[PDB]
Short mmCIF file of C-alpha atoms and ligand atoms in Angstrom, two decimals:
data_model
loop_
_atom_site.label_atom_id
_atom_site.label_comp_id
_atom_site.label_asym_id
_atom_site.label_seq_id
_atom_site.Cartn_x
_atom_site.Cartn_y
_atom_site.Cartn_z
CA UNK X 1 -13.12 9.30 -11.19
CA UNK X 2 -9.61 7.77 -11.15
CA UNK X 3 -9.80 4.37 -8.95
CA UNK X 4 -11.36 1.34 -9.10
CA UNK X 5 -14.83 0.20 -6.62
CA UNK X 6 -12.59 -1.17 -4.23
CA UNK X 7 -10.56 2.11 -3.67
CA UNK X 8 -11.42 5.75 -5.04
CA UNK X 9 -9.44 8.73 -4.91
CA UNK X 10 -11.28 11.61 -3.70
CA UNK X 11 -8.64 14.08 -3.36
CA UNK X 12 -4.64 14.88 -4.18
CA UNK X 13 -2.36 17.97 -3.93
CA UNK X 14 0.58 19.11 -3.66
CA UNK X 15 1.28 22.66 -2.59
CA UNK X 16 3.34 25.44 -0.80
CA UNK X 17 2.42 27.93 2.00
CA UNK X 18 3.93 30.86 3.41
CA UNK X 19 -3.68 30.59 1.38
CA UNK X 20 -1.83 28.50 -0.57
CA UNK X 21 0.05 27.76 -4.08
CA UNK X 22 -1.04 23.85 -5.55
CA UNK X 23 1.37 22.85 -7.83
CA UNK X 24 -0.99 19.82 -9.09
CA UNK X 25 -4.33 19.28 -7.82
CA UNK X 26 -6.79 16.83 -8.32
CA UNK X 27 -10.27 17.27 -7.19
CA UNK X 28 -13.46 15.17 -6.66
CA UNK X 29 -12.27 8.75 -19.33
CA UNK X 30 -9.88 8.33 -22.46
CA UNK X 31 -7.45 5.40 -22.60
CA UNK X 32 -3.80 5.28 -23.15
CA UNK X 33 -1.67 1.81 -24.16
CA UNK X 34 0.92 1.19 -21.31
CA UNK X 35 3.47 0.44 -23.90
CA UNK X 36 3.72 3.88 -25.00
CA UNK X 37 5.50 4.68 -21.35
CA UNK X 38 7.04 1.52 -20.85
CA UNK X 39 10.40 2.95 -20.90
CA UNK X 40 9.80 5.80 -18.42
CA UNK X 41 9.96 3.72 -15.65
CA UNK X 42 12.09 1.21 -13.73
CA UNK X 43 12.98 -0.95 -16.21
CA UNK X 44 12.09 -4.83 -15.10
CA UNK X 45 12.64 -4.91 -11.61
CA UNK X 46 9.10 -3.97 -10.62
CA UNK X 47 8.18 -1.06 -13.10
CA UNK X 48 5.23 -0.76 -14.77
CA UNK X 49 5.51 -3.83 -17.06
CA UNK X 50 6.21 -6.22 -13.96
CA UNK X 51 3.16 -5.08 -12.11
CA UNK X 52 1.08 -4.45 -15.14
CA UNK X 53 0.45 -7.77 -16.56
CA UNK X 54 0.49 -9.24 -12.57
CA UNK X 55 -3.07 -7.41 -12.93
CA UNK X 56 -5.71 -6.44 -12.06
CA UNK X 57 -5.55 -4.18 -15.65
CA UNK X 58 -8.42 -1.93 -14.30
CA UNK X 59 -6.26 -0.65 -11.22
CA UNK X 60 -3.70 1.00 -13.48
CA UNK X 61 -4.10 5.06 -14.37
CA UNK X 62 -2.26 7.39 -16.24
CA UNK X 63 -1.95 10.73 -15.04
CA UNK X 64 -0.41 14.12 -16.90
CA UNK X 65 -0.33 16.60 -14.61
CA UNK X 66 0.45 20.09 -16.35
CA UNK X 67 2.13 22.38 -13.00
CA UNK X 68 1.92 25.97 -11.86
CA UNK X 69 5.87 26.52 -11.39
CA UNK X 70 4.89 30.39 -10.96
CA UNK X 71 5.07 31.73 -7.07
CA UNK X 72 7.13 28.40 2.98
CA UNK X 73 5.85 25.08 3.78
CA UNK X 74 6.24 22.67 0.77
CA UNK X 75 3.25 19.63 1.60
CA UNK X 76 1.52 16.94 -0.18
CA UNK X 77 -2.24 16.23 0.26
CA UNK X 78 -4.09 12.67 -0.33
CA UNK X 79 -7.47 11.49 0.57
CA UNK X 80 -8.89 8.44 -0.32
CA UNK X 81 -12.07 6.38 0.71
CA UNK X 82 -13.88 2.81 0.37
CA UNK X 83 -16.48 0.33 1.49
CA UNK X 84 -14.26 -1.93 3.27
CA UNK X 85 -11.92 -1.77 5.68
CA UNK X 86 -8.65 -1.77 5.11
CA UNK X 87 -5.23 -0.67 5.77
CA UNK X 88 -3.10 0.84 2.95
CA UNK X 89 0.21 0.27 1.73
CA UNK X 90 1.30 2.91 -0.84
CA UNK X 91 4.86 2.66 -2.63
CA UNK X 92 5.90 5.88 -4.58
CA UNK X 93 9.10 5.60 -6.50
CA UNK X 94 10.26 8.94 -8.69
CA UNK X 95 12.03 8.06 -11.71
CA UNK X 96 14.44 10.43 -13.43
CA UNK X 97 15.45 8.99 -16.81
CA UNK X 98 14.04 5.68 -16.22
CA UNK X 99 16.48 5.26 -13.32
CA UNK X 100 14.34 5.18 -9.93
CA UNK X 101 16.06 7.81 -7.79
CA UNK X 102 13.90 7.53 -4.74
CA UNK X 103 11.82 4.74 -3.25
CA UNK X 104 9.00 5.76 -0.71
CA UNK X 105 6.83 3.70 1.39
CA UNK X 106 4.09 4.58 2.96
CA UNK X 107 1.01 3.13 5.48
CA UNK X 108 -2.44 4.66 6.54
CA UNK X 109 -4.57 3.05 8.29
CA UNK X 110 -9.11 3.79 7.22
CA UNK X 111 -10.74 6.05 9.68
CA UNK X 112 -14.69 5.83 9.90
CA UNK X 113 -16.40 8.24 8.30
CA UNK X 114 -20.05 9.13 7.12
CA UNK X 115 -20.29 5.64 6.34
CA UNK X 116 -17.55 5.30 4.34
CA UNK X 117 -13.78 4.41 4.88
CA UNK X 118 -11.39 7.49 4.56
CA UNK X 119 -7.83 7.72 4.45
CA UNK X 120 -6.02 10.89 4.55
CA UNK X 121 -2.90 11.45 4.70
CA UNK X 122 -3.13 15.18 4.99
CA UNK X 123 -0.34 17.98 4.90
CA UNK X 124 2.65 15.56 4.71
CA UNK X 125 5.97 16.84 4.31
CA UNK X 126 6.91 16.61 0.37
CA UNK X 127 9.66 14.73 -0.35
CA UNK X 128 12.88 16.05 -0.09
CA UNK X 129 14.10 15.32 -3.45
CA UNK X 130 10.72 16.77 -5.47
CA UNK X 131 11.56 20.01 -2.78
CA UNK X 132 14.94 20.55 -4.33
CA UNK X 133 14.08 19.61 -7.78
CA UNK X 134 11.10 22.19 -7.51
CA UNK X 135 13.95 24.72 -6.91
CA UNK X 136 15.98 24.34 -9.53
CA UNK X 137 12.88 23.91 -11.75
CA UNK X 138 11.62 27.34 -10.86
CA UNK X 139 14.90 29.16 -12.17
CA UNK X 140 14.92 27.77 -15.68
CA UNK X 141 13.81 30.85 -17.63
CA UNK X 142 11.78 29.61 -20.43
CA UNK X 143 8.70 26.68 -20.31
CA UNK X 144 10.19 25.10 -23.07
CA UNK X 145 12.82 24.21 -21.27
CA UNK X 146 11.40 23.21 -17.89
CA UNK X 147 9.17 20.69 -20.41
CA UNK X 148 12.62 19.29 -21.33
CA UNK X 149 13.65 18.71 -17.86
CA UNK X 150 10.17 17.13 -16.88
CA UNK X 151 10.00 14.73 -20.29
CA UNK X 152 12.46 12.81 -17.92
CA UNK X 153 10.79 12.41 -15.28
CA UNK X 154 7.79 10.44 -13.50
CA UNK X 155 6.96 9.35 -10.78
CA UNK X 156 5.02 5.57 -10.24
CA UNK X 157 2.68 4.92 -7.83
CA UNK X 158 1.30 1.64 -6.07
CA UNK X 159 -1.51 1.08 -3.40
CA UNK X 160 -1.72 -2.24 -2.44
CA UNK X 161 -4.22 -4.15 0.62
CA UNK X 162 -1.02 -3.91 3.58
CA UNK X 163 -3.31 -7.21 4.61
CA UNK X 164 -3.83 -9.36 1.25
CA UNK X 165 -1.06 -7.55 -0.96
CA UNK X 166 -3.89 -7.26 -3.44
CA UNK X 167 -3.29 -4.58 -5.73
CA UNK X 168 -5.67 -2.02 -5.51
CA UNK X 169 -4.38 0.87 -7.41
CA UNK X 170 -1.40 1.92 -9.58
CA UNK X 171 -0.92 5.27 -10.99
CA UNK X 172 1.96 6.36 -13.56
CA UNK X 173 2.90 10.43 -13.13
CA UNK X 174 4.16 12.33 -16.04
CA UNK X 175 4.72 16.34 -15.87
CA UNK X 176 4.50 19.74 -18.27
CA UNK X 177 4.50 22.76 -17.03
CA UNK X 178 1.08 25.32 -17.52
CA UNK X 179 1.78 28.86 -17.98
CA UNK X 180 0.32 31.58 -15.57
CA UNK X 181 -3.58 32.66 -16.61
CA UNK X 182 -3.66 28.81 -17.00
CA UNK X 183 -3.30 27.15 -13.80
CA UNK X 184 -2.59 23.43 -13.15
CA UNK X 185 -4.25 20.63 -15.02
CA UNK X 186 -4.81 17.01 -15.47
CA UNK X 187 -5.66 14.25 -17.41
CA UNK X 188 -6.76 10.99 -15.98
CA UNK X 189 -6.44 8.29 -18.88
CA UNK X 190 -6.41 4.62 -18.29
CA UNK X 191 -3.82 2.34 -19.13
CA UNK X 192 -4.59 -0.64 -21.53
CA UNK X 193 -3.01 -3.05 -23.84
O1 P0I Z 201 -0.82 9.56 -1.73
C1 P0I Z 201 0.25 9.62 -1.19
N1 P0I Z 201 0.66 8.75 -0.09
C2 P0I Z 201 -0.21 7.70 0.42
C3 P0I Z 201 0.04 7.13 1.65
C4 P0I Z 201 -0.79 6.12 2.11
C5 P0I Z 201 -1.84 5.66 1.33
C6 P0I Z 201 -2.07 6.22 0.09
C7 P0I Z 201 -1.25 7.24 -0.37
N2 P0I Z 201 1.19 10.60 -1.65
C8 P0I Z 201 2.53 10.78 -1.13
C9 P0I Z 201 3.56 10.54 -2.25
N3 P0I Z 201 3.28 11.29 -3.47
C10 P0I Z 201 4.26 12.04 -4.23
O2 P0I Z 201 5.39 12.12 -3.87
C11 P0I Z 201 3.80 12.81 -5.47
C12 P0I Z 201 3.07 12.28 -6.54
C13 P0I Z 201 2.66 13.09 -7.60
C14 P0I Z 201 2.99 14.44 -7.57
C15 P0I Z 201 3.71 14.94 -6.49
O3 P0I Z 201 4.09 16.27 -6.34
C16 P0I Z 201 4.14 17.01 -7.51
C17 P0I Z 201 5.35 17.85 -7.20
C18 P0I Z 201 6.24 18.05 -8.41
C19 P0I Z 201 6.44 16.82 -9.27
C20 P0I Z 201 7.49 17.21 -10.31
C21 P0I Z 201 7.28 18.62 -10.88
C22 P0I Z 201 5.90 19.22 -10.63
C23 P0I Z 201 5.48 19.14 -9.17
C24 P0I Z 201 4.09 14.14 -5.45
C25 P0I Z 201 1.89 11.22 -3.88
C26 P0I Z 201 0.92 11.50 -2.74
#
């Protein structure tokens, strides 16, 4: 699905409670040229054109997530799984008009599972920033407009091997918003060059 044979995600939401509201899901291809995005991310210090050509090219995905911003504990889920053992290293950095406001790293070690390797990291607290931006989000009054906000914003993702430093996935985040009788969506492209 999105992931390479080394690492595969199975699973990724991120959600409120008060059973439950996802804001983007995705549950378990088209390509896209990197340098479209280039300059949504952090510029040279480790953005998307650092790591890109550093390779492996295959590990890189571009998500669009269109949200439900129509609706309590605000979570994030992940699950991923693979054939060896490993443990990950995943750094998240959100990016609001190509400036990286927030740096997050991350470390989960694979549980054995049905044999295969699973890491979960399940019902984590979201972020505080994407919390508070979620609430000012909500009270803009039109879509158009909460597409304006979001245009700036994305967030980059990077699993590496904590063990080798290998790369083993890399994931770019950009954001509409859905209306109501649609709910969320994705598109997983790839990113080439
Ligand atoms: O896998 C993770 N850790 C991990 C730890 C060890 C090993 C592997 C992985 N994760 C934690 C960090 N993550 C995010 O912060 C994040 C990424 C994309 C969307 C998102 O929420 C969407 C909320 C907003 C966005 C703006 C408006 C619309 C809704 C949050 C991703 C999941």
């Amino acid at each position: 699905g999105l992931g390479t044979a080394r690492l595969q995600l199975v699973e990724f939401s991120a959600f409120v409670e008060p059973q439950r509201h996802l804001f983007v899901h995705i549950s378990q291809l088209e390509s896209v040229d990197v340098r479209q995005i280039y300059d949504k991310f952090p510029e040279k210090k480790g953005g998307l054109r650092e790591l890109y050509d550093r390779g492996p090219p295959h590990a890189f995905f571009l998500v669009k997530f269109w949200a439900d911003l129509n609706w309590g504990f605000y979570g994030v889920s992940s699950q991923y799984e693979s054939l060896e053992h490993m443990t990950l290293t995943c750094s998240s950095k959100v990016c609001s008009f190509g400036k990286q406001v927030v740096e997050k790293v991350e470390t989960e070690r694979a549980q054995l599972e049905d044999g295969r390797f699973v890491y979960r990291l399940l019902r984590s607290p979201m972020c505080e920033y994407l919390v508070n931006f979620l609430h000012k989000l909500r009270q803009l009054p039109e879509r158009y407009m909460m597409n304006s906000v979001l245009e700036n914003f994305t967030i980059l993702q990077v699993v590496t091997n904590r063990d080798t430093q290998e790369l083993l996935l890399c994931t770019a985040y950009v954001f509409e918003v859905s209306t109501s009788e649609r709910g969320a969506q994705h598109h997983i492209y790839r990113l080439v060059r």
